[PDB]
Write a protein that binds this ligand. Structure first.
Ligand SMILES: Oc1ccc(Cl)cc1-c1ccno1
Ligand SMILES: Oc1ccc(Cl)cc1-c1ccno1
Lengths: 546, 546
């Protein structure tokens, strides 16, 4: 039975292949057929290319050796190479044009998800060209999804030499009959087959994947649309900043480019952005996903006043100061969405652009107490329940697994009607003791939240709701202002607490506001509809945040 | 007696002042004298500018109000404003032209170093212009050096209103007679003086600083060249990455821009780069200063093989992978300098550019054992002493304070002659028990190294020297290669271990190599000559690493 799947890079996981570009160049320059592919393989096991693929020489050292072989070949063929002939230019273009074969990677992702050990086995080079970063990026994106990456130039062996196949088997810790090996080169497939491995000659991806699903017994073609890449907490870079004597802020960091600061809601974690973090880093951004004050590995002081918007915002500015960041784009959801609008109003110079998921911007009413305003809408009753210190803490801390399984549900699986919470005497009074697992979350993801909330519980998080009068007084200072920096409001059709209609008057205070809207989406936006959140945020970031 | 110094921003810590640009614009456009400065202050305490300075409105809301005042003023003066007249353009240019008044900041730095509480008190605005980042950067650079930053738009009060002075006093926790207040506006100086504060009217900086040194009794003018800004460990962003099950790498992170990975030597710390970190972040780079494997907060496994160059380099590649970085510029010193040359040889696609302080690149000799090679030079005797497990550990761990005070010395203060270390029976056998403090380090800096080395001691660090045969075999695989990515070699005249002449043949293997050379510099390059290290690295980074 098969338990390992091995994929080649060129012509398998990345398309189009370099081999195909040499043939394409021959046709474009009207050179004799096979001239370039012949000069490329010249000398066979003793040639310039084998030395390159084994790591004896770098790509920049190889370029003039390929040039001499091209001259040698054209001379024999009794043809002249064009006066403008450049191997450097041909290969720069070829490497740059090569993209990830998305359905092939998807199949590799599915096999690994089903228990297969996966690896990339590739005949590659040590790239020292001025434009080497493009390839470095491609390799980074691909390698994360595999258990192993075996590169010829790193191991000093090449396909089709028998030793590299014995090396692969040793790294996989598998017998040959347990391995599927996919290659676009028949000669490189031959030693794997001779060893007893299942082999697939990759021409077109569809046929190769049909062969792959037939032999594995796993559906790989015509499959439902997969979720975006998630985060393994133990594989992330974890950052810590002391913003003041008793306050440290924890964050997860991924990627390079403009700083994008992700701010979660209640009662969440940096992990609520698990599907956004890899996608935003891949899109060309440096992601900083916070554990907001009171949560996870961030400090959780007991005082109510430690959680007023004025102090929370001041600390986020100090956080940027200590990291040496003059700005960041601030993206928030629920309570984080509220923080993010206040960062834009009070610290516009530090906010590159601002985006909110579900949380609308509604200016403070100076002629009404926030407590009066909250009583006016039956949807905000849960906020009154959260007022009395200790009451909501006891219900939320009683059974953590039940707390997160009851809360984290899609619009069609709700177990909590958020009205008459005070009258009913709690959030979960009409909710089961052992809720079923929502289609949005796995048991393991629920257990990550349970483990995080064991440190500080719900006091700090609930204190975010206990500064209504303080926040109202502070917000009233901003009443003559408008938000004029780039801004995005993302509404969720089925969020019955932060309803899309609550955002209807926002253009009065944010004239240049851009919008996003997600159909069939509940309150837990990021995990309910990750693919669509990613598409909206990436499109807005590339157009408005650089 | 004075214990607090307060500085204005415009016309004091930043030059030229905005007030001066309005007068300059009047002259350039041949407008009536004072027309623009009059439209700017129009309405006085009830005008558009006061509302802006109090934070009622943002800068972008203020621009059209200033335009209307300019029209109102020109109408009364019976003059016409040019057809191309733009307040947005005038202010963008003014804000952009304004730079830190370096001798004023230097004086503030000196007063704080001598025990003064320092603060910036400024009449400023909430900047929401598309080009707001320039000002955000200026403020970031300035604010770090002060105990307090009081901004009119944040406190809702302005100079010359009496309340802001009472507010300043309350934040300083000082009586008026204990405060020096420096301002370029006579009217804004008046309430501080009326309160009993010492006041300085700032016209030209030299005269203001003469007045300031006379009144404080501290030398501020004609002072020796100051050292670059250092790091307070508790104020840095601390990052942690698990590169494999039992190995976590710790780093300090500062700044935005291309990733610059700093790799220390033996027996050091991320803190050895304390003078480079703020300077490189200020220069426009994202600094990642490592605790190399075996050091500080990074994991220190006991096995010798965990510290061979092949594994150390593999882990640094994984470190980039987990951070989502396709590349970084790698800068190393001593052992870090060696690591960095091997990163360039084995992983050029991941290395944006490479720089080494003191450590030359010398290819492995395939016809000689590394032990033979080390015996040939009397300067490398200390490496033979480091071979036997436990011997060097006992001497180095015996008295940590003595270890670091004996090692960390300038070329003219050496207490260690590194020859006949084996014959003498140790590094410190002819060294005092209580060495004097070198002019390079403070007692507190020595104690930071003592605290770091208390966790794992010297086993992991010494193991870097215990993989000679392993490293030689690995390096021999790279003998046909050349380093063709951007590279810098920095030599130190007085490093008697890593002598500048050892680097003489480097151009044979690195043809495009760039060089830096530091006179009167010992082995501890970064702390011996920080200003010159910063100048060389910043110039090379801006030209060769983007
Ligand atoms: O918006 C919310 C805010 C707080 C809490 Cl505890 C729950 C929700 C919510 C909306 C839908 N299901 O839970
Ligand atoms: O280069 C060195 C390497 C190791 C050790 Cl322990 C000391 C030095 C050194 C050079 C000058 N003073 O110490």
């Amino acid at each position: 039975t098969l338990r390992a799947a091995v994929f080649d890079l060129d012509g398998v996981l990345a398309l189009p292949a370099v081999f195909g570009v040499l043939g394409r160049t021959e046709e474009a320059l009207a050179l004799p057929r096979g001239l370039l592919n012949d000069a490329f393989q010249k000398g066979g096991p003793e040639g310039a290319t084998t030395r390159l693929m084994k790591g004896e020489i770098t790509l920049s050292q190889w370029i003039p050796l390929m040039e001499e072989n091209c001259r040698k070949c054209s001379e024999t063929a009794k043809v002249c190479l064009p006066k403008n002939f450049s191997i450097k230019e041909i290969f720069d273009k070829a490497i740059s044009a090569r993209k990830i074969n998305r359905p092939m990677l998807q199949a590799a992702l599915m096999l690994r998800k089903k228990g297969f050990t996966t690896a990339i086995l590739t005949n590659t080079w040590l790239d020292d060209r001025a434009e080497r970063d493009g390839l470095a990026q491609l390799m980074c994106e691909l390698k994360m999804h595999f258990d192993f990456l075996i590169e010829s130039c790193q191991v000093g062996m090449v396909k089709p030499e028998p030793q590299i196949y014995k090396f692969l088997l040793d790294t996989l810790k598998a017998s040959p009959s347990e391995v599927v090996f996919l290659d676009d080169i028949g000669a490189n497939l031959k030693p794997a087959r001779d060893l007893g491995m299942v082999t697939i000659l990759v021409q077109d991806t569809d046929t190769a994947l049909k062969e792959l699903e037939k032999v594995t017994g796993i559906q790989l073609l015509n499959t439902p649309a997969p979720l975006p890449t998630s985060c393994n907490p133990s594989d992330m870079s974890h950052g810590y900043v002391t913003v003041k004597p008793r306050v440290r802020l924890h964050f997860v960091e991924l990627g390079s480019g403009p700083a994008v600061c992700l701010c979660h809601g209640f009662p969440e974690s940096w992990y609520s952005w698990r599907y956004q973090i890899p996608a935003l880093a891949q899109a060309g951004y440096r992601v900083l996903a916070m554990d907001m004050k009171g949560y996870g590995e961030s400090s959780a002081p007991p005082e109510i006043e430690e959680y007023c918007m004025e102090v929370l915002c001041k600390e986020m500015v100090t956080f940027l100061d200590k990291l040496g960041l003059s700005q960041a784009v601030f993206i928030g959801h629920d309570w984080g969405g509220m923080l993010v609008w206040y960062m834009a109003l009070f610290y516009p110079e530090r906010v590159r652009a601002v985006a909110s998921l579900n949380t609308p911007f509604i200016p403070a009413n100076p002629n009404m107490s926030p407590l009066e305003s909250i009583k006016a809408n039956p949807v905000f009753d849960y906020q009154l329940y959260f007022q009395e210190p200790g009451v909501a803490e006891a219900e939320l801390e009683q059974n953590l697994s039940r707390t997160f399984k009851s809360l984290f549900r899609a619009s069609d699986e709700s177990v909590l009607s958020m009205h008459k919470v005070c009258e009913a005497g709690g959030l979960f009074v009409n909710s089961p003791e052992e809720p079923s697992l929502s289609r949005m979350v796995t048991e393991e993801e629920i257990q990550f939240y349970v483990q995080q909330f064991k440190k500080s519980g719900f006091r700090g998080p609930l204190n975010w709701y206990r500064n209504m009068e303080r926040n109202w007084k502070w917000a009233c200072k901003s009443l003559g202002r408008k938000i004029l920096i780039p801004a995005l409001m993302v509404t969720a059709e089925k969020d019955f607490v932060l309803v899309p209609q609550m955002s209807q008057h926002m253009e009065d205070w944010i004239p240049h506001l851009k919008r996003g809207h997600i159909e069939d989406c509940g309150h837990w936006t990021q995990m309910d509809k990750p693919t669509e959140v990613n598409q909206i945020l990436i499109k807005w970031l590339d157009s408005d945040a650089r």
